[PDB]
Design an enzyme around this catalytic site. Structure first.
Site, PDB file in Angstrom:
ATOM      1  NE  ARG A 102      -3.926   1.978   2.406  1.00 11.61           N
ATOM      2  CZ  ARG A 102      -4.319   2.663   3.477  1.00 11.61           C
ATOM      3  NH1 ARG A 102      -3.877   2.349   4.693  1.00 11.61           N
ATOM      4  NH2 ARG A 102      -5.163   3.670   3.328  1.00 11.61           N
ATOM      5  CG  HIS A 103      -1.270   4.885  -0.527  1.00  7.86           C
ATOM      6  ND1 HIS A 103      -1.306   5.724   0.558  1.00  7.86           N
ATOM      7  CD2 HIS A 103      -2.526   4.395  -0.675  1.00  7.86           C
ATOM      8  CE1 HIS A 103      -2.526   5.729   1.067  1.00  7.86           C
ATOM      9  NE2 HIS A 103      -3.294   4.942   0.328  1.00  7.86           N
ATOM     10  CG  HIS A 163      -5.043   1.599  -4.396  1.00  8.99           C
ATOM     11  ND1 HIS A 163      -5.232   2.942  -4.166  1.00  8.99           N
ATOM     12  CD2 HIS A 163      -4.838   1.473  -5.729  1.00  8.99           C
ATOM     13  CE1 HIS A 163      -5.165   3.597  -5.306  1.00  8.99           C
ATOM     14  NE2 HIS A 163      -4.887   2.735  -6.269  1.00  8.99           N
TER      15      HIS A 163
END
Lengths: 264, 264
Positions: free
Chosen positions: A7-8, A193
């Site tokens: 994930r970011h 994500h």
């Protein structure tokens, strides 16, 4: 072979809340910083600063999370041969900062793949975010590959897509990524994500997807830079989630503090 | 003249909880890291690793909070002439990392002042924490002044001290700090505890201390690196809290993530 999915990093809109633009932009649409967790600059966008509303940048702490993961990969002697990301700015910036930690930001070029964007149900309104195109990302000193031809271009995404469509396109694009990287370097990194860790790996492993209720419950448990590894055994060719070559990263908050409200 | 007072950076025991030592120390009492928010090393202590239980170190993100504050002071051209800290390891480490951000870690030496330790009521049991002495802090690469003579030595601190005693010694020590720095540089930085922001500045400003119940409720609102500035007004000589010369720092968490529990 390993497929790493993460994930970011911390996103500005979550930290600074509903009116975050008012904390980052002046009456002339020019970037201002009002907190040490805000970067020193942000890219100019075609539609001006309001293009950030549906496509927020990472914070300074998001940059640091990303760099620390890249540094941990380097320290573990894990070579990354190819890096892909979702077109969301937060994902591109995270991928860039992972490369900085890896000391590969002047070598690897990030492949921006709209097929890696999260379930479009989670976008506000009737249109997709106005993503910054790879040419402009490159101009903003994010180490993006402007020659990469995506598997699912932006206009192939539907704002009304079903859960089934999201999961299936995640599988499709991940297979295409694996195929085009095969025998050209054994490790692939996807920076995307919360939902991508499972969406990209579930059917790859031969598994049946969860229902959307259980899926969303799980997605809410994936922290910034949450990292997994799906390895291809080679004795069988079956992909399986396995321990990543880096440790987890866990930290707490530093909450808002108004010295006038608290110390007077 | 400005007196700056701030809280230490993120503490390891809060992030990793009740059994944090078991995540940081092996069966031989040797430091291990099990998370990317843990540093690569910790100092050896006289009583071994269990001395950390009442005197926890900062995390990697605590170091970064501190560095960012130092960098902001540098960027704003806020010159710090002297730096003092509480003997708690978390406070010493924060001060060291502020100096690194300031680019003054090879110039200034931190004055460790047990008078800056928080209200001793908040210590577990019947003895104070076994603080690492300045000689050993310097040996552990933490820019401490081993020649500093404290105003309130360790053995002058009472284990059973009252609220009034805590507030009064905070006033006393702060006056002595200001006096010994008079005409030796206008800005003084204290790196200490949540409670220090008010305890060090209340009576200095000619204010009456709050009752202890209200005080404790307030102390819980001061985040890591929470920063205030008490300025001596030119026309009157009255000290008053004023806006700090640097922006606040706010960020969210990166929660624990076990891929086996969440993705399998």
């Amino acid at each position: 072979r390993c497929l790493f999915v993460c994930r970011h990093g911390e996103r500005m809109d979550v930290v600074f809340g509903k009116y975050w633009l008012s904390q980052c932009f002046d009456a002339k649409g020019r970037y201002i910083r009002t907190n040490l967790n805000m970067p020193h600059s942000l890219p100019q966008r075609s539609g001006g600063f309001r293009d950030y509303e549906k496509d927020a940048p990472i914070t300074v702490f998001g940059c640091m999370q990303a760099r620390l993961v890249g540094e941990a990969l380097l320290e573990s002697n894990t070579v990354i041969d190819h890096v892909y990301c979702s077109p969301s700015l937060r994902c591109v910036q995270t991928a860039h900062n992972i490369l900085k930690g890896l000391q590969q930001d002047n070598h690897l070029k990030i492949r921006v793949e709209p097929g890696l964007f999260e379930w479009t149900k989670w976008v506000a309104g009737s249109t997709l975010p106005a993503w910054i195109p790879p040419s402009e990302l490159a101009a903003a000193n994010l180490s993006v590959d402007t020659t990469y031809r995506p598997h699912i271009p932006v206009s192939k995404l539907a704002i009304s897509e079903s859960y089934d469509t999201y999961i299936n396109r995640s599988f499709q694009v991940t297979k295409e990524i694996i195929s085009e990287c095969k025998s050209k370097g054994n490790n692939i990194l996807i920076v995307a994500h919360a939902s991508s860790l499972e969406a990209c790996t579930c059917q790859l492993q031969g598994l049946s997807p969860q229902n959307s209720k259980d899926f969303v419950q799980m997605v809410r448990k994936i922290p910034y830079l949450g990292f997994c590894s799906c390895e291809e055994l080679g004795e069988t060719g079956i992909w399986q989630l396995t321990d990543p070559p880096i440790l987890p990263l866990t930290h707490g908050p530093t909450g808002g503090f108004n010295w006038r409200e608290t110390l007077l």
